[PDB]
Design a binder for this molecule. Structure first.
Ligand SMILES: *[C@@H](CC(=O)OCC)[C@H](C[C@@H]1CCNC1=O)NC(=O)[C@H](Cc1ccccc1)NC(=O)[C@H](CC(=O)OC(C)(C)C)NC(=O)OCc1ccccc1
Ligand SMILES: *[C@@H](CC(=O)OCC)[C@H](C[C@@H]1CCNC1=O)NC(=O)[C@H](Cc1ccccc1)NC(=O)[C@H](CC(=O)OC(C)(C)C)NC(=O)OCc1ccccc1
Lengths: 181, 181
């Protein structure tokens, strides 16, 4: 898992920030240009707090699949002149299944912490926060509040964003290449 | 830092546990035979909770240097028939200074989380919890309550146990080979 950790630390240094919304504090991953992602439940307002700084939300697409089903990601275009290093090349075209993964968190609660969550398997459909939801990836780790937005990685791969947990497993929504125009 | 992470994950799997004392929940590192360490302020009682299990404390040496000064470690001999894999070979004879380190935490608050804290320099004397204290190692990371007992490592090396923080830096007490008979 050494190279996975090394990839994660560099990714999070390069592309991540800490976001507060009216619904809480989350890890946020910048993808390319000016577009970042959060879990849908961050319910980002017209302004967010990004590393303690007010930033405007030029647009915010909550994502769903063709059968209108919940995917639990919101994409945001940020009013800022700096551009995110482009990490679309790191995003798979479909759900990745991995034997060793790292979940990386960047909040006030969990500043730069990394968790080896072990095996990620494709879980697909889950009833999450009561909402039917697809394209879920599952790892057996006791995830808590304060970990949403967590970025799930393996060597060379950005697999998903942490969005939920039942107290015993956690679930990332798959960050698919095609979500990004 | 890849190999440091890989060393840490294996160390913590092999030698660490979660301890609750009347003073809180800590990460605990088993050293050899039946002897483990905590920060002195864990103030371990005649019984501890180790991974949720009552265990007796056959002896408990709080450590100080020759000038009676605070080192902020308590060594404990545990009433249990399992033996700790012997990691004394991993403990330096004097304070190690490192450019990249990992701090590894194992509590209910922070279960298996790892933090790259970067550069560790020898700090020696610090006024800690108001107590004069020596053999301190310092890293620039915002450490919090719930991280004491944290094990600070680099590839192949167990450097110290996390014992304090001022909100901006954290401090480990050096885990020296000679402390272990
Ligand atoms: C991220 C929020 C955060 O970081 O806080 C910012 C301050 C949080 C992380 C998970 C919650 C507990 N552990 C986690 O890893 N996610 C959520 O809170 C998420 C919110 C949400 C909102 C809107 C739509 C979907 C999701 N909700 C869940 O993860 C839920 C929480 C829950 O209700 O379950 C427990 C109370 C933890 C048991 N998890 C969930 O729905 O699991 C499936 C389930 C629940 C009940 C019965 C059967 C199956
Ligand atoms: C570990 C306890 C834990 O994990 O809880 C179990 C439930 C905790 C971790 C540090 C505290 C805050 N951040 C940390 O990384 N350690 C302590 O609480 C430790 C207790 C202690 C007890 C007895 C003897 C020595 C130490 N105390 C400290 O780390 C103190 C805390 C403090 O008083 O400072 C702040 C309030 C955080 C600012 N740190 C300290 O003394 O720093 C030096 C200092 C303080 C004030 C002025 C100048 C210099």
């Amino acid at each position: 898992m050494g190279p996975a950790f090394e990839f994660a630390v560099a990714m999070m240094k390069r592309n991540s920030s800490t976001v507060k919304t009216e619904y809480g504090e989350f890890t946020m991953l910048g993808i390319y240009d000016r577009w970042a992602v959060l879990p849908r439940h961050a319910k980002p307002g017209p302004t967010i707090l990004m590393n303690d700084q007010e930033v405007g939300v030029l647009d915010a697409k909550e994502l769903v699949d063709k059968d209108g089903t919940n995917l639990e990601l919101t994409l945001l275009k940020l009013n800022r002149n700096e551009k995110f290093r482009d990490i679309r090349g790191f995003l798979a075209k479909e759900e990745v299944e991995v034997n060793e993964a790292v979940l990386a968190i960047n909040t006030s609660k969990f500043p730069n912490m990394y968790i080896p969550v072990g095996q990620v398997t494709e879980y697909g459909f889950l009833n999450l926060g009561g909402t039917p939801t697809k394209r879920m990836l599952m790892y057996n780790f006791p995830t808590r509040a304060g970990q949403c937005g967590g970025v799930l990685m393996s060597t060379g791969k950005v697999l998903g964003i942490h969005v939920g947990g039942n107290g015993h497993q956690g679930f990332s929504a798959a960050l698919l290449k095609h979500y990004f125009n």
